[PDB]
Amino acid sequence: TRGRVKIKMEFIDNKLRRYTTFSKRKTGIMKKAYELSTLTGTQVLLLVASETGHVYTFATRKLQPMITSETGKALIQTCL
Amino acid sequence: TRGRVKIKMEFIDNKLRRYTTFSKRKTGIMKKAYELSTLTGTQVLLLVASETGHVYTFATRKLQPMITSETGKALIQTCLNSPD
DNA sequence: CCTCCTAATTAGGCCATG
DNA sequence: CCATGGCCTAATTAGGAAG
């Protein structure tokens, strides 16, 4: 097919494409976080919130409280 | 050269090789974070802590306070410095 | 601590499905 | 409706090893 197209760095107006891009890139960066974490053994935290009010997150042991602790969850919710 | 190599998902014992990977991977995931954020217009928060203790971070407008505030910064500090 | 040669690896449309 | 999930290719991204 046309292969991967060089998308211009800008907000995708087409709701369809925007959402489609989100799911893919969301999964991508999530794996990247996992990889960086395990490979170098460094503490990583990732939080992504979709328009659909979904909060996809990834956190390392010592950083989990940021999203798990009531205190952290509160801050997160406040920011959103 | 040989090209890119299939790195087995595990802790890189070779400290120098490890940090080399970290430097690239880090800047890469940071780029991704920016791209996803600006592209889809969604809120993103990234936090990466090196062995050296450096806390490299990135966050979208709404999430900035998470890393730039007494409450936010404190929480980050507590986690990193609390027993495991 | 922050380029080169290449292969590993994401994604982009697009359509399909839970 | 929304979120993935392949398919087919092409744009990136990191190893390894040096600058």
User: B21: which chain A residues are within 8 Å (Cβ-Cβ)?
Assistant: 39-40
Whole-angstrom Cα distance, residue A31 to residue A71?
A: 27
Burial track B48-84 (b if 16+ CB lie within 10 A, e otherwise): bbeeeeeebbbbbeebebbbeeeebeebbeebeeeee
* Phi, psi at B15, each rounded to 5°: -40, -45
Return all residues near B17 (Cβ < 8 A) that are at least 6 apart.
Answer: none
Q: Which domains does chain A carry?
A: 14-80 (3.40.1810.10)
Q: What technique solved it? A: X-ray
Give the SS3 label for residue B48: strand
CA distances from B83 to A61, A62, B56 (A): 11, 9, 21
Angle, alpha carbons B17-A60-B66 (nearest 5°): 110
Cβ pair A22, A50 in contact under 8 A: yes
Buried b (16+ CB within 10 A) or exposed e, A25-61: bbeebbebbebbbebbebbbbbbbbeeeeeebbbbbe
Q: What is the resolution of this structure in A?
A: 3.2
Length of chain A: 80
Q: How far is the C-alpha of A72 from the C-alpha of A69, rounded, in Å? A: 5
- Contact (Cβ atoms closer than 8 angstroms) between residue B29 and residue A32: yes
Q: Is A39 helix (H, G, I), strand (E, B) or coil?
A: helix
Residue type, B74: A
Contacts of B66 in chain A (CB under 8 A): 75-76, 79
Strand order in the sheet with B43-49: A55-59, A43-49, B43-49, B55-59
Between CA B77 and CA B64 the distance in angstroms is 16
Q: Which of residues 22-61 of A touch strand D (CB under 7 A)?
A: 22-23, 26-27, 32, 39, 50, 52, 54, 56
CA of B12 to C1' of D19 (A): 24
Token pair for residue B32? 């991704």
Sign of CA dihedral A46, A60, A42, B69: positive
Q: Which residue has the tokens 């500090």?
A: B77
What letter does residue A61 receive in the DSSP assignment?
Answer: G
Residue A48 gets which letter from DSSP? Answer: E
